[PDB]
Amino acid sequence: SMILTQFGPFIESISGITDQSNDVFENAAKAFSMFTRSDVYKALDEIPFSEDAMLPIPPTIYTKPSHDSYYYIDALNRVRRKTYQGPDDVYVPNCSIVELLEPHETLTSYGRLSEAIENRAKDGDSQARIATTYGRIAESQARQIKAPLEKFVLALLVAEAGGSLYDPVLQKYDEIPGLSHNCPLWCFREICRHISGPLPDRAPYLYLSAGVFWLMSPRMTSAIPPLLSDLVNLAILQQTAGLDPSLVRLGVQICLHAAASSSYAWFILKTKSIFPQNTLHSMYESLEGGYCPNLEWLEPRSDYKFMYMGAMPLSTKYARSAPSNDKKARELGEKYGLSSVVSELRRRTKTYSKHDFTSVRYIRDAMACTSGIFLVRTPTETVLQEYTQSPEIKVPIPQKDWTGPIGEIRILKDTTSSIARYLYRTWYLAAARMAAQPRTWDPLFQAIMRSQYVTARGGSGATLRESLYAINVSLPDFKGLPVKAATKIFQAAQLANLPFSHTSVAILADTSMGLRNQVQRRPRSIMPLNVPQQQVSAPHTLTADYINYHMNLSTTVIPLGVYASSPPNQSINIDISACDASITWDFFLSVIMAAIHEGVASSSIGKPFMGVPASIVNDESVVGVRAARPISGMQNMIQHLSKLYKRGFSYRVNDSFSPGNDFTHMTTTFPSGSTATSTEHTANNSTMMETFLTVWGPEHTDDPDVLRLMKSLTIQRNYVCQGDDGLMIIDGNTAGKVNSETIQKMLELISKYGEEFGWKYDIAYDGTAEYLKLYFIFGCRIPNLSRHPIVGKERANSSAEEPWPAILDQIMGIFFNGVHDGLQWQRWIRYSWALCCAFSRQRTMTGESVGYLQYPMWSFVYWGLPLVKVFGSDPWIFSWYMPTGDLGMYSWISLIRPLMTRWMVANGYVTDKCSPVFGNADYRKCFNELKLYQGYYMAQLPRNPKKSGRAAPREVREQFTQALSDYLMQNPELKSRVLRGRSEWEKYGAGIIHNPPSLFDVPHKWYQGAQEAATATREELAEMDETLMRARKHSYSSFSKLLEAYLLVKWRMCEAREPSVDLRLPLCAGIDPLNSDPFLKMVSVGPMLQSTRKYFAQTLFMAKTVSGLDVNAIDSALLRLRTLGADKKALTAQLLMVGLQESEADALAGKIMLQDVNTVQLARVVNLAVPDTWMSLDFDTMFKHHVKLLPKDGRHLNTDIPPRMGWLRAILRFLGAGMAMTATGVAVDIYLEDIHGGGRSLGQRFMTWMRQE
């Protein structure tokens, strides 16, 4: 009622009752900024609840002991925590935050970590350092949320106070239960009330952007800020993902038991798999009916092309013959005292016996309820726990099987009984066939190899420059630059003019750390490498790329698992645990470096690689002879890289969360962020699975069934792997599904294969497929809602976060992750309304002058949030598969344009001047009043702007850019061809675009790419404020040239496309006849069915699509110079500024003058793009067959296009398909009505805009 007194018009404005207007938008936004936490906590007291949300809370959360017994000091003064229950108990305790605290100076009830304890810890006291470690890690756990916490639940109450809505297609009220029913708001309300108590201030903590302020209640524990994020996550999902009460109540019970435990994040780790194991891993186990897709492989088994050959029914034979799950899951529930939850989940799972929509929705509802916090620990725990792992090799390579040394490499013998000879054979032949290619000695290929690894995310030369000072080489420091010294670009410009022998001992330096938190996992510790170490590992990446692209070729996502999950085709999921740590010099890296150093010997015998000269090392490879043998370039790089692989890696660890912790220690783990990590892991996974199936399997079996199975399986036909993991497809034979006992015996034989040479296969076999963390059962896609939380964002550093226009940038990503998942749009997109309205006003704090900021609603619709009612239209009228930007804006205003023009004369805005789009009305007095024009151009304004540019002196700036040009370009044929292309382009083609994509942009581009993370403080933020104020105070007179160019054309929709797939088939979780728009659109157009990573690769015209610069911009520049005139030498020179041999550039320019471009590629002249919401759906057949020109009424003479400038057909394809997809309901065949100007006038206006881009 109290909320209703101020939000009367707005709650009904977004619920489809009245239309959305700028007036209630701005009044509501005034209200959205005007709040207090007491004003939010009147609300949750105000709403009465129906007791189905009520359940007991144990009292052991609020009383938790002191934290002094949990931490101790190592013998090297390392602060590490004491483990009580297993070595995985290394996380944040849940206890006693009120005592190490000092109150704020004007917020007398909120407080902060004490300054005295910080000073005594900077002295070096024991207990002070322990206390500040616990305090800072509690702050870092409490920080991991996007916006402040109450703002989300406020937007929840504003959106969801409207009650149940009216579905326009289904013509009924939805039975999403009201806000008075849900468990998590009740638990949130009661925990906040009991934590406040007698205090007048009611919030448990306050979120400033740097760190949080607490509340001085003696019953406060540190488990509360992740718990409230989980509880508001379950409350925000239940309203809009169509949950039941019961699974939400079970998830809330598990969160309460998580707070009751001795450590919150540790329990969330150890119970991360109760919900999949009882429902998804144990599904149906006896069935009688359903429908499943009948996919069929297209015979070349490297191309990954598919065919949907219809639906097919099910029978009793296709019941789950996977082994049991009862004893292990009951033990897992029994060990932690969660037996009621696992018994309830199993009782409800055993009911279902028919594969249809409701069972898949139940699986999605059970997967959605796992906790969505980010697990966090101090970085010293990460480094001292996960890096101490090391592989055990039960059958090593015997010491007789190696020859003597060649330099510091021994060769594996030919007469070797070990299994490593197949790895040696594979990597030998791969190295020889790599080095025999004439592609590898292309200087453009060398230049793109050097351009590959010097990325902006490059760090840790932080002891390299000290070690290079320790070997007495003179490095320029470039004093006077606004670069930071840590970037890899600055480091490569240091190492530009130095011989390889001087930087040879630069290889054995260390590396610092980079931390990334993950959903329900241990925190990922990414790590860089320095410049000579990433240079010297070039055969190690080239040979693995040749494996993954030419020899074994597993794969460089969804329809693969839709095939592999189809019920006659079982699948085995293969995960390799600790796959970085389990490759060392003991087995792998020894035989890898031996095979590469031996395989590259022939075809590169004397010639050197980039920068690295030839050398000589002596050999003793035959026992009788000893000599010195000349060494080529790539062999020499293997010689230098082998020292580093033998020694192991030291890591320079510095955390900000605990003072006094500073250490290095050696490790043998493979580095995560190298230039050859994922390709190397795929290559080794593929090679070991191959030599498994072809040798080691048949050597250790007696069963003809298992032997007959392993003869038919091969990695070329039945095994797909990415990174470390993958699945293995088992085809269904003639008699049905393959017998599960033989598959079980082969599985327990794969585990014995792994325990020989170091690996530890994590193998799950349950009749489902996991692949790149996407879970598919019976050919049905299931989104993991718990993987994408709405509330939390990953923060690793303790540095303060971004300014205002980025927290509003992230929410379009929130809405799009809602789009990719299956949500009831009736309350989800209305929640997106209330939230994005709530984030719109800011209250800047500039000196003595009061200024306010607000984006209009039309900006939010320009970014991709489709409207509910426009100007007297039907409620719930638009779809969220609309394009973002001008194409979208055009389409949904064109769907309503007559009714919108007729609404213009309601409250009459009448003008004599008759326009072809509007006629009776004027649009200025309407649209500049409603800030549609201002919101259109204000959405067009760039977010997160910054420019430091701290007065670079010209001499040392020029020396930095010249050294960067010298490092990127060594070979002067590249310089000659790019100066030749520049000169010919300024001769012929310059003038029409005045903006070239050139290679000399890249030294400048990397120069400012160093200062893309300078985060200067005040002046450009105030400059952003001034630009937004002047762009608000303006009054435009029209749209842009693109949209006014679009407004001339018209279309017409009818005759309602035939269905692509069956309607009864469950294809995706969360779309069904209950979710009318996305499921109905899915059945209309059909799903993707293509690999869609080779489709976009076929689109781009570049010979390998590798430049280091924006290949979309090169293809756009070539097409824009094609369509406007511009004699062929302009295109030759434009290609030569990217750099070619002057001949293939000329040939490709003469080609691109003439051939017909594909439809999707011609977006580049007009800067369109397919939205990512259309990636799940098919589009290509809709473009080729369901948006066509030359309508059913015949010619209209505003339908003809000349044979010259026929690209307008392909852009009108995008136009009609956007007009199809913006409408709710099915996709509809649309033909081309009048365009009012002709192809002449449309081509002239398009060329007129393409004069100035």
């Binding site: 007559p898 023009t901 326009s915 789009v917 006629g919 009776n920 009048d1234």
Partner: peptide, 18 residues
């Protein structure tokens, strides 16, 4: 009040629409 089909201009009398 009646309206046109090209340019959607809404008018009032049918002879004015013609």
């Amino acid at each position: 009040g009646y309206q046109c089909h090209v340019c959607s201009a809404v008018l009032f009398s049918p002879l004015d629409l013609d």
